[PDB]
Scaffold this active site. Structure first.
Site, PDB file in Angstrom:
ATOM      1  N   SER B 200      13.089 -11.045  -3.678  1.00 53.77           N
ATOM      2  CA  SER B 200      12.074 -10.800  -2.607  1.00 53.77           C
ATOM      3  C   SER B 200      11.792 -12.079  -1.821  1.00 53.77           C
ATOM      4  CB  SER B 200      10.827 -10.212  -3.264  1.00 53.77           C
ATOM      5  OG  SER B 200      10.038  -9.426  -2.373  1.00 53.77           O
ATOM      6  N   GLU B 324      13.226   0.585  -2.672  1.00 50.74           N
ATOM      7  CA  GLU B 324      12.601  -0.679  -2.291  1.00 50.74           C
ATOM      8  C   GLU B 324      11.171  -0.483  -1.806  1.00 50.74           C
ATOM      9  OE1 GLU B 324      13.321  -3.918  -2.343  1.00 50.74           O
ATOM     10  OE2 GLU B 324      15.333  -3.787  -3.243  1.00 50.74           O
ATOM     11  N   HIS B 437      10.796  -1.798  -6.336  1.00 50.11           N
ATOM     12  CA  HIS B 437      10.982  -3.220  -6.071  1.00 50.11           C
ATOM     13  C   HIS B 437      10.616  -4.043  -7.297  1.00 50.11           C
ATOM     14  CE1 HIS B 437      11.416  -6.558  -3.164  1.00 50.11           C
ATOM     15  NE2 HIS B 437      10.474  -7.152  -3.880  1.00 50.11           N
TER      16      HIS B 437
HETATM   17  C1  LIG Z   1      -4.583  -7.494  -0.511  1.00 47.95           C
HETATM   18  C2  LIG Z   1      -3.100  -7.211  -0.566  1.00 47.95           C
HETATM   19  C3  LIG Z   1      -2.440  -7.496  -1.749  1.00 47.95           C
HETATM   20  C4  LIG Z   1      -1.072  -7.256  -1.849  1.00 47.95           C
HETATM   21  C5  LIG Z   1      -0.366  -6.727  -0.769  1.00 47.95           C
HETATM   22  C6  LIG Z   1       1.111  -6.483  -0.920  1.00 47.95           C
HETATM   23  O1  LIG Z   1       1.778  -6.049   0.019  1.00 47.95           O
HETATM   24  N1  LIG Z   1       1.704  -6.792  -2.237  1.00 47.95           N
HETATM   25  C7  LIG Z   1       3.102  -6.613  -2.545  1.00 47.95           C
HETATM   26  C8  LIG Z   1       3.444  -6.671  -3.995  1.00 47.95           C
HETATM   27  C9  LIG Z   1       2.760  -7.738  -4.817  1.00 47.95           C
HETATM   28  C10 LIG Z   1       2.967  -7.795  -6.293  1.00 47.95           C
HETATM   29  C11 LIG Z   1       4.293  -7.296  -6.869  1.00 47.95           C
HETATM   30  N2  LIG Z   1       5.399  -8.254  -7.102  1.00 47.95           N
HETATM   31  C12 LIG Z   1       5.173  -9.546  -6.877  1.00 47.95           C
HETATM   32  C13 LIG Z   1       6.170 -10.499  -7.075  1.00 47.95           C
HETATM   33  C14 LIG Z   1       7.428 -10.074  -7.514  1.00 47.95           C
HETATM   34  C15 LIG Z   1       7.641  -8.724  -7.737  1.00 47.95           C
HETATM   35  C16 LIG Z   1       6.603  -7.819  -7.526  1.00 47.95           C
HETATM   36  C17 LIG Z   1       6.860  -6.385  -7.770  1.00 47.95           C
HETATM   37  N3  LIG Z   1       7.114  -5.602  -6.748  1.00 47.95           N
HETATM   38  O2  LIG Z   1       7.527  -4.362  -6.969  1.00 47.95           O
HETATM   39  C18 LIG Z   1      -1.006  -6.442   0.403  1.00 47.95           C
HETATM   40  C19 LIG Z   1      -2.395  -6.685   0.515  1.00 47.95           C
HETATM   41  N4  LIG Z   1      -3.010  -6.364   1.775  1.00 47.95           N
HETATM   42  O3  LIG Z   1      -2.546  -5.456   2.448  1.00 47.95           O
HETATM   43  O4  LIG Z   1      -4.042  -7.028   2.226  1.00 47.95           O
END
Ligand SMILES: Cc1ccc(C(=O)NCCCCC[n+]2ccccc2/C=N/O)cc1[N+](=O)[O-]
Ligand SMILES: Cc1ccc(C(=O)NCCCCC[n+]2ccccc2/C=N/O)cc1[N+](=O)[O-]
Ligand SMILES: *[C@@H]1O[C@H](CO)[C@@H](O)[C@H](O)[C@H]1NC(C)=O
Ligand SMILES: *[C@@H]1O[C@H](CO)[C@@H](O)[C@H](O)[C@H]1NC(C)=O
Lengths: 535, 532
Positions: B200, B324, B437
């Site tokens: 990512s 994804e 993802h």
């Molecule tokens: C307030 C807020 C908070 C988060 C978002 C946002 O779009 N987050 C995306 C995913 C984050 C955690 C997952 N993750 C993180 C690192 C590596 C892998 C993964 C797993 N993925 O499957 C968006 C907002 N917002 O819209 O304000």
């Protein structure tokens, strides 16, 4: 009278007729050919609405096809059957408003459903006398009464100075309407039932059928409709009043001419001079565009066919609609560089890009690129076979398949009973090359039952196939339902609905039901492109 | 003391720790400083190399997590908490970790460097899913992971200013890479064979090191999991970065020198409090402070750099997971939630596309809706939900990955592509999210090999195969086993044949064309649209 066949003598509103006893493979039929239904639209009547035929005296001989309406004669492949089967087979004349009637022999005792054929030819050509429109098989095998009419084409039928008295436009459609009125008044004299009349036609004839559905005065003249490979909506079947006036004014100058003085000068020109310039008034290099077609006059067509199908009430209507498998292939050889009946027509990416501009001639650069990106195979973007077939699909989808899918969808949503098909069998006698697949117009000979003529060298399965289709069309004419009432064993033909979008494949194999008429692609043409147009 | 746990690097001595892996011990050196703590007047500044230290520095424990937003969408739900910081938060966080086999490798061993994701606003190298002990023990690899600054502290930029030049978080990564060049041989690593891999935001970081000349002398191969430097979320223009930083400063109460001075006096949480408030549109899959096209670290847009670059002596492994986009819908798109099947109406689907393609005009969003509608079932909830996920994943990951693979392959690079299609037996997200993802990471790092996490036997065998693909790629630039002589092999991705492989429980299957038709829409048509 005295020694004539008493079954060939018939009176109609205009006088007495003598018809001819024809042989069909299974027995005799009665034909009444070249019945005049209008005053000859000649001289000061050129470009005018038709006037009803004045009674004649004596017995009019109705044993020959009459003149073909003056028209462009195609010369693309001189001597080739694939082209000449469509060319006029009787003398060209502006005196051409005649119709033809086939009935069983002897004429039926009880009143019999009437089929009325409206030929195609891009509104610039066509004749009810062509071999592929021969009514004798439907009359003999299904007992139908079949009527076909000549109607004016090209400038004589559709040149319009909208708002003028001397050229109101759409007179070719009024010719067809007059013949429908002639059927209403006279067909009972042949054993036909005027209260059961089905219109059917192909291409521009199908568009004509669609126009009669949309024009209120024609609605009291028929009860059911078949639209083969054509629609009154879509990009080629109508023009605006403004565009019709521009095309008529340009043709006038090209032949040397206030609307009264202009039309008066046009009436002094030889018919051939008008035909010689008909193709020169199109706004862009194109295929599947015709110079003189029905105009949105606010009279015959109170609005665009688009507006009228999108809103009108059709609860009383029963329609059969369909397409052939390769609607576009035929038209590529009339203008897209790289296409010929004599080669495989494998084209380059560059020729596909140039062809898209010619086959979608009203598209801006952005719209054309949308088309190219949609139809390109991005795993093989340069493969000549995929590009050739994509060019054919572009032209067929834009001009026929997606206008039909839209028509079926609006008709079903607004109360009509719709039955849809795709015709997928290529005649073993086809003279066009194999890359063209199942080309436009090559289901007609099966509807009319030509395979039952043993001298035409169709296969046995094609004869059985033809009889299936004649049964479908005549059952629909008879009932509003193509299915055999006594034969539930066979697979059934379900109606097209917006929810299930069912249609059937017509081929040598039993009826197979499919869902969605090019649903994804037609969303591109019918929903996205118009919204792109507005930008 | 254990001599295998004592190492001298250029800055002084370190003591690591012997850790148990299922098949034997590993040497781990956790919390090695590679930079001066970027605190005080150093906030927003490029990193500086760590000063030498006296004595033996204790490297038996993970160091602090870079200061960052903490996710609260589902408090105490493992599927989200597994990404949350698992150590204390600090701006003093520039530390890296090294795992090696025990005993230390006799030969110089290929090095794998992990760069975590987290949308450039979050992440840590101490997360359980980045545990390097399995790769070290089973494949004998030397594994390195670093912390880099995220959010405002890593990417707040007043471009052209001296004290917030942008991209310092990418400079943190680059300093760890130079640290590996200078020091990894002391652990038995081979500095002449360094493979970057990341997921990512981490994969987009890997890609930005491909596109930045000073980084290229620091690694030899690259792996980009579910992320790209190109595409719509990974970079901002100089002007947009300036706007977002100026807005954040207004929100916390502050020419550039004075503005950045006042920002430096603000406690860390004051900056994070407003991090999400500077996005120009209501959106998902968008992040406030990300790399900036500065004309320095990125001499041009990633689009222009991948389009005109020379990638001949480069090998790259890239891929996506099967779904994804599903993960991100619960963070903004009405009607989506962890806790029900998220069957949406068509009206919700149109509303969702404006949020998932927030930079799209009316006409462009209309094109998207018409493209992803199944016009045989245009109103069916299950199709609309799955289409919503597809729009988000295609726009943000799949089609950027296909554009990158295609540019790289055509311009000399050796590319291998995959799609990961196995949903973990232990997944806590609902079934409708499919293969989300980020849930291929645990398999590549080899966590199924730990019996206490209750994976299945097939998943352990599956993990071992993935570990071998990745480390074979690290050793050779080719993921195929040079010992296995059974078909099928993993073929290189090319522009002509466009081959990629599915990663799942069944043997490798070779497919052609990576959502070719749909990515033509995103990559060829939509740009011509918006721009006219
Ligand atoms: C307030 C807020 C908070 C988060 C978002 C946002 O779009 N987050 C995306 C995913 C984050 C955690 C997952 N993750 C993180 C690192 C590596 C892998 C993964 C797993 N993925 O499957 C968006 C907002 N917002 O819209 O304000
Ligand atoms: C100079 C010229 C000449 C012809 C065209 C042109 O576009 N022709 C196409 C139509 C002919 C089809 C005959 N036909 C009629 C009724 C029913 C079926 C069929 C054929 N079955 O598929 C175009 C030009 N031009 O552009 O100059
Ligand atoms: C087929 O014939 C036409 C005209 O003769 C020509 O322009 C075209 O390029 C030919 N196609 C092939 C594949 O040879
Ligand atoms: C049909 O086949 C016979 C076989 O001798 C041939 O002579 C005749 O010309 C053919 N007719 C048509 C219309 O193909």
């Amino acid at each position: 009278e005295g020694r004539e066949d008493p079954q060939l003598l018939v009176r109609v509103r205009g006088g007495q007729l003598r018809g001819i006893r024809l042989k069909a493979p299974g027995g005799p039929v009665s034909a009444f050919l070249g019945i005049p239904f209008a005053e000859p639209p000649v001289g000061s009547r050129r470009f005018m609405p038709p006037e009803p035929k004045r009674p004649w005296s004596g017995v009019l001989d109705a044993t020959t096809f009459q003149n073909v309406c003056y028209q462009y004669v195609d010369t693309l492949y001189p001597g080739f059957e694939g082209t000449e089967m469509w060319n006029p087979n009787r003398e060209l004349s502006e005196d051409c408003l005649y119709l033809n009637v086939w009935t069983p022999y002897p004429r039926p005792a009880s009143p019999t459903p009437v089929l009325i054929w409206i030929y195609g030819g891009g509104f610039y050509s066509g004749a009810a006398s062509l071999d592929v429109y021969d009514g004798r098989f439907l009359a003999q095998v299904e007992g139908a009464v079949l009527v076909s009419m000549n109607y004016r084409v090209g400038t004589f039928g559709f040149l319009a100075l909208p708002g003028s008295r001397e050229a109101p436009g759409n007179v070719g459609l009024l010719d067809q309407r007059l013949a429908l009125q002639w059927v209403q008044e006279n067909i009972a004299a042949f054993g036909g039932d005027p209260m059961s009349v089905t219109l059917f036609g192909e291409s521009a004839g199908a568009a004509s059928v669609g126009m009669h559905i949309l024009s209120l005065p024609s609605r009291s003249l028929f009860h059911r409709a078949v639209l083969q490979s054509g629609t009154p909506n879509g990009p080629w079947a109508t023009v605006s009043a403004g565009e019709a006036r521009r095309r008529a004014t340009l043709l006038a100058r090209l032949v040397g001419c206030n609307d009264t003085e202009l039309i008066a000068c046009l009436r002094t020109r030889p018919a051939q001079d008008l035909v010689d310039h008909e193709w020169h008034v199109l706004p862009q290099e194109s295929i599947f565009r015709f110079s003189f077609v029905p105009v949105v006059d606010g009279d015959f067509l109170s609005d665009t066919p688009e507006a009228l199908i999108n809103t009108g009430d059709f609860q009383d209507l029963q329609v059969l609609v369909g397409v052939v498998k390769d609607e576009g292939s035929y038209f590529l050889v009339y203008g897209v560089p790289g296409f010929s009946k004599d080669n495989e027509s494998l084209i380059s990416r560059a020729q596909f890009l140039a062809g898209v501009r010619i086959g979608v001639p009203q598209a801006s650069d952005l719209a054309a690129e949308a088309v190219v990106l949609h139809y390109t195979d991005w795993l093989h973007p340069e493969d000549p076979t995929h590009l050739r077939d994509a060019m054919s699909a572009v032209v067929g989808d834009h001009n026929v398949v997606c206008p039909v899918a839209q028509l079926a969808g609006r008709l079903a949503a607004q109360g009509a009973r719709v039955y849809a098909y795709i015709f997928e069998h290529r005649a073993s006698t086809l003279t066009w090359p194999l890359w063209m697949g199942v080309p436009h117009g090559y289901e007609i000979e099966f509807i009319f039952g030509l395979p039952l003529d043993p001298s035409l060298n169709y296969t046995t399965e094609e004869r059985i196939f033809a009889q299936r289709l004649m049964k479908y069309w005549t059952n629909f004419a008879r009932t509003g339902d193509p299915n055999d009432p006594r034969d539930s064993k066979s697979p059934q033909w379900p109606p097209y609905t917006t929810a299930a979008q069912q249609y059937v494949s017509l081929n040598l194999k039993p009826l197979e039901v499919r869902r969605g008429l090019r649903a994804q692609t037609c969303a591109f043409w019918n929903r996205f492109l118009p919204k792109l147009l507005s930008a």
